């Protein structure tokens, strides 16, 4: 029943139903695995973390998941602060000069200087290099996030820490369709850096304002849209000179060497 409520996108109803299941069978680790993931989709971070702890205690084999995703949930809170201009994200790989105006634009927006913020983003975008490549076999001349606050930057969680990765620091990305409910929130990815490094990563898969300002469908990544405020909610979307690809549909992305 909770399963079917989830499928219908009825999150509140699904949660109510699932909590009653857990209450009925409180030592069933699998119900608590469902519950943690559902709470994550709903953005109830502390409660999702609570369930992970209990999962860890019931099923010790689940402990590496518990470690990975409890620190992923901590990172999801840094996101709100980052996009509110209150927290500086670290940058992985070679420093990119044009990140600085992007970050300053976030803090100028927060102070109500939207014109000055737009001026800095325009300068950042001008400076950021168009790098050609391929999505699968389909070529592009440039690629960026549809979120103008990011442009050609990828949000990542790597080794337990939130970061921005300039796309010009990226050589390739490989991702599969989402498989588990938690994958709607954090899509697993294999990254290869322009500098040679390779790392597994988690990609925050929804825009940060989705939890507070989206609907259930946006929280489930079943749509992407822009609010009257101009901010996007729902599933991450990449745009190119030639088309667009939503993150859940991306499989292989490659950039041509500079």
């Amino acid at each position: 029943i909770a399963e079917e409520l989830l499928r219908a996108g009825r999150l509140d109803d699904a949660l109510k139903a699932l909590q009653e299941q857990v209450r009925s069978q409180p030592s069933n680790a699998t119900l608590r695995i469902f519950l943690f993931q559902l709470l994550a989709v709903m953005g109830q971070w502390a409660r999702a973390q609570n369930q992970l702890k209990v999962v860890g205690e019931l099923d010790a084999s689940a402990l590496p998941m518990v470690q990975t995703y409890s620190t992923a949930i901590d990172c999801e809170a840094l996101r709100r602060e980052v996009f509110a201009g209150r927290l500086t994200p670290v940058i992985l790989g070679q420093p990119a000069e044009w990140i600085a105006p992007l970050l300053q634009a976030l803090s100028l927006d927060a102070e109500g200087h939207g014109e000055a913020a737009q001026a800095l983003r325009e300068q950042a975008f001008d400076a950021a290099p168009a790098v050609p490549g391929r999505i699968g076999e389909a070529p592009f001349a440039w690629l960026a996030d549809a979120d103008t606050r990011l442009g050609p930057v990828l949000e990542v969680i790597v080794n337990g820490r939130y970061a921005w990765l300039p796309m010009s620091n990226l050589r390739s990305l490989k991702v599969e369709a989402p498989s588990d409910l938690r994958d709607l929130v954090w899509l697993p990815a294999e990254l290869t850096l322009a500098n040679g490094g390779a790392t597994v990563a988690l990609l925050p898969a929804r825009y940060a304002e989705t939890v507070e300002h989206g609907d259930d469908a946006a929280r489930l990544g079943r749509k992407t849209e822009w609010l009257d405020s101009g901010l996007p909610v729902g599933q991450r979307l990449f745009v190119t000179d030639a088309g667009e690809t939503a993150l859940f549909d991306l499989r292989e992305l490659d950039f041509e060497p500079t």
Binding site: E3, L6, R7, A29, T30, L31, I33, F34, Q37, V55, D59, S61, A62, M65, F125, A128, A130, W142, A144, A146, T148, G151, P152, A177, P178, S179, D180, L181, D183, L184, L220, G221, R222, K223, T224, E225, W226, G234, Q235, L237, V239, D241, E244, A246, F248, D249
Partner: peptide, 24 residues
Amino acid sequence: QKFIARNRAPRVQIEYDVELYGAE
């Protein structure tokens, strides 16, 4: 025009059936 989405209309997406009970 680089890096700019030309359209900000809502996007309908492919929906994925996902697993609910697995931790590996």
